[PDB]
Amino acid sequence: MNHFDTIIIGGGPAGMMATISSSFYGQKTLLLEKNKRLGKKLAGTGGGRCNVTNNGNLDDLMAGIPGNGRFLYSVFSQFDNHDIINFFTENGVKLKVEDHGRVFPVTDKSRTIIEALEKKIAELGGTVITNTEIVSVKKTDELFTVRSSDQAWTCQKLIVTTGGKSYPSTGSTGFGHDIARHFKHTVTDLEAAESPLLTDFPHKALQGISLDDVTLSYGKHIITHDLLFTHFGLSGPAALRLSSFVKGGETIYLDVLPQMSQQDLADFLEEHREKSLKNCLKILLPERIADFFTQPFPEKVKQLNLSEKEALIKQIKELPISVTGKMSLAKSFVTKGGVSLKEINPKTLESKLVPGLHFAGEVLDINAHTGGFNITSALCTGWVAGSLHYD
Ligand SMILES: Cc1cc2nc3c(=O)[nH]c(=O)nc-3n(C[C@H](O)[C@H](O)[C@H](O)COP(=O)(O)OP(=O)(O)OC[C@H]3O[C@@H](n4cnc5c(N)ncnc54)[C@H](O)[C@@H]3O)c2cc1C
């Protein structure tokens, strides 16, 4: 029997969640996935630990989804980040919160998240067929026909959850945009968002250092968040966020101690005048950062003259960094752009052009910061798309 009430294409978080709600509402539901495994992209989020959502309040959630977050009022009125947390804990998955509201499985293993979702799908009678690339979708009368190279499936309701365009090696290569265009939907310009930065800097001096809530400035863009020094440049939220405003050739500025004024730092130094400059700074900064700034100066605080102190303080508060480029769309964490939201019903995620056609997840023209916000949108829009609505 190749006929289902609801067919979902793409088994990332949107598709898995859509399969669960579709089954929960009593639809006979089929999830088709290109890869052998579900949630291949999802599994690599949060350094492989799976940043499944964010525990913030409404203000935090909206701030975390700056690419059309407003569209989600109705979705979030039906299923939100607290429902995601509840769902996992109610199915015996223990969750924890880390910095900036980031939620993870306590196990620190993505398979904990993915297996719980599969288990729920099975328990609700959903069917999943993996290792099956869908290559065609068409609608005739009131039936969608979904085809691989090899087989055909039909349904009354189709949900497209095939992702965006970044990290195409995980399986997100744009098929959902093709389906959209086939049904005469507008797909907006697609472009990199949340892109690690390439810099011209001595990377080995600092690589692997993470800094908490430091400030990166370029023009009027001042971003305060965590920063990661990498072998090629900068990553972590502060760099990812600023990457929306730089593309190469710019000088950006780093303030490693945003909570201390230049005067506070001058007082700190005066109160530690008998000390080694590098050692006394360890209470404020990681040792490798203290090494970087203090290397060319005299060893003890009191051995610095006034010029040296002022020079050092300005370096700590305003380090110039030369940005040479940013990762391509393929090498970025999020796709900015997707199916035009004007053509989508925000309450149901149904196409305004073709009845029974739905989109959820990053295939839509919604983009968010890393830290759980894209996964939240995908899970929540998935849930809602899979739900039935009565009136
Ligand atoms: C390295 C990295 C780190 C990230 N970290 C974070 C983070 O910390 N917080 C956060 O919120 N977001 C993060 N993201 C983004 C987040 O992972 C995605 O936005 C989210 O997974 C989108 O979910 P989705 O279900 O819309 O699409 P995806 O998870 O991309 O799933 C789409 C699925 O559709 C399948 N598919 C595509 N075409 C076909 C076809 N023709 N037939 C069958 N199946 C198909 C694909 O194989 C894929 O499994 C990160 C992304 C990357 C790449």
UniProtKB/Swiss-Prot annotation:
Keywords: FAD, Flavoprotein, Nucleotide-binding, Oxidoreductase. Induction: Constitutively expressed. Up-regulated in the presence of peptone. Part of the aao(So)-mutT operon. Gene3D superfamilies: FAD/NAD(P)-binding domain, HI0933 insert domain-like, Translation factors. The keyword Flavoprotein applies. FAD binds at A14, E33, I134, E362, N374, I375. It holds the Pfam family HI0933_like. It is an enzyme of class 1 (oxidoreductase). Disruption phenotype: Inactivation of the gene causes the elevation of the cytoplasmic levels of the prooxidant aminoacetone, resulting in an elevation of cellular reactive oxygen species (ROS) levels and ROS stress. The deletion mutant no longer produces H(2)O(2) from L-amino acids. The deletion mutant exhibits slightly slower growth than wild-type strain. Double deletion of both aao(So) and mutT is lethal. InterPro entries: BaiN-like, BaiN-like_dom, BaiN-like_dom_sf, FAD/NAD-bd_sf. Its EC number is 1.-.-.-. One of its GO terms (molecular function) is nucleotide binding. Disulfide bonds: none annotated. Its cofactor is FAD. Flavoprotein that probably catalyzes the condensation of two molecules of aminoacetone to yield 3,6-dimethyl-2,5-dihydropyrazine, which is subsequently oxidized to 2,5-dimethylpyrazine. It could be involved in a microbial defense mechanism related to aminoacetone catabolism through a pathway yielding dimethylpyrazine derivatives instead of methylglyoxal. It has also low aminoacetone oxidase activity, and can produce hydrogen peroxide from aminoacetone. Belongs to the BaiN/RdsA family. Monomer. PANTHER family: OS12G0638800 PROTEIN. Composed of three domains: an alpha/beta domain corresponding to the FAD-binding domain, a beta-domain partially modulating accessibility to the coenzyme, and an additional alpha-domain. This is Aminoacetone oxidase.
